[PDB]
Amino acid sequence: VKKFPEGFLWGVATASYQIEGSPLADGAGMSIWHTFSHTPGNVKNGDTGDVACDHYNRWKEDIEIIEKLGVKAYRFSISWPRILPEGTGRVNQKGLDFYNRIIDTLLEKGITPFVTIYHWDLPFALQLKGGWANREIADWFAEYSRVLFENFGDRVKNWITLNEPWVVAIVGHLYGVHAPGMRDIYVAFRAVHNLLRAHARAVKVFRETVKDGKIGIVFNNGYFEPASEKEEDIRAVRFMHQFNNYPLFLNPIYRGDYPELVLEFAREYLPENYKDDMSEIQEKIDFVGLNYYSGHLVKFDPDAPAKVSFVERDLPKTAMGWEIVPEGIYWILKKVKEEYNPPEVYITENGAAFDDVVSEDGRVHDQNRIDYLKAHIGQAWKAIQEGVPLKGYFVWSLLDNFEWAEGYSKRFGIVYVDYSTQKRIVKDSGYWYSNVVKNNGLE
């Protein structure tokens, strides 16, 4: 038996564009994911978020599932252009109505909201002005955040500025695989810097508006391991951790500068007086959210850009081909404590995609996903025994949904969605997790 601390928060997580559909309903402005997915060639099968899980219309049923499962917290994101269709200026009341009904319903049913302010659906209007590449986005973002804090901060007390700024910057602006689909290393690093500035400015506004609330920020992370004991493989791991994991953002927030290895590598691409902003970037945060999915074997590689390559291992993998390495969640939790000692930590995403089949019984027998979640939850419990201030754990995701450039082909839910009928089918992992929450841990 592995029992969690009293008061531990068990949650599930979604994002607005991945589940809502109706992107243009009720006066919403377009997002960069609406325009990106409507561009041929960017998303598998030509999938878009036009309908998704139709959560825009089915939100009450989906909250009733969270309730039936006994899940205690729901991490969801708000669509910036539903709220401010032009990015700044005029507030769309019907956008506020939509999330208000959600928030009120969650509270009525005793489910704690965790609101992600930005989960990648930038208003298109702002992308016309440069989006994350433009310094002024710190103002735009602070303004938008103010509107949310004023309208929802009476009821919502747990907030996240940004989901995975590394991904927004690097995948969206260097690899070009996500919206807005750019491949320019100088833009990518200006995005990294502006995300940090926007985040800190939103926290500053949060201190003025929501006095009894907590605010944090969420990072993607992988568990990097060296391919050999050669010094250059060991340095490669250190590089990959500093660049791809929390230190890229937490070294600024807690220590006032980018990690040594990141400066070494990327000083050319950062704005020349970037350090002038570090004072403000260090605005105090209440918690760190860590997302974690996979582990990678790394080697120094002279032919690779960045000089690092991944080495495939004989390990179990998900349907994404991502190696399943549960002790990675223990390592990332121990390490964030050793390096930055944040006051509270949450696992804000953990989950897996598997080739789910609805059987003749009308059920989804996803033992593979249970085994995945079980192993990671056990490792998180171990981190807690060793003194990591892990306050909650959120499964990605409540629902199968639009998996970005993968479209609907990759299913992460603990609830299956038949897109033809929009029927929800709770998966065996869904029932299993319900029991984890009831037991407050593993039996």
Ligand SMILES: CCCCCCCC/N=C1\SC[C@@H]2[C@@H](O)[C@H](O)[C@@H](O)[C@H](O)N12
């Ligand atoms: C080259 C190998 C890199 C491994 C990539 C692991 C990606 C794991 N991240 C996932 S797996 C699926 C989820 C997204 O649905 C969610 O919106 C994002 O916050 C999040 O990025 N996410």
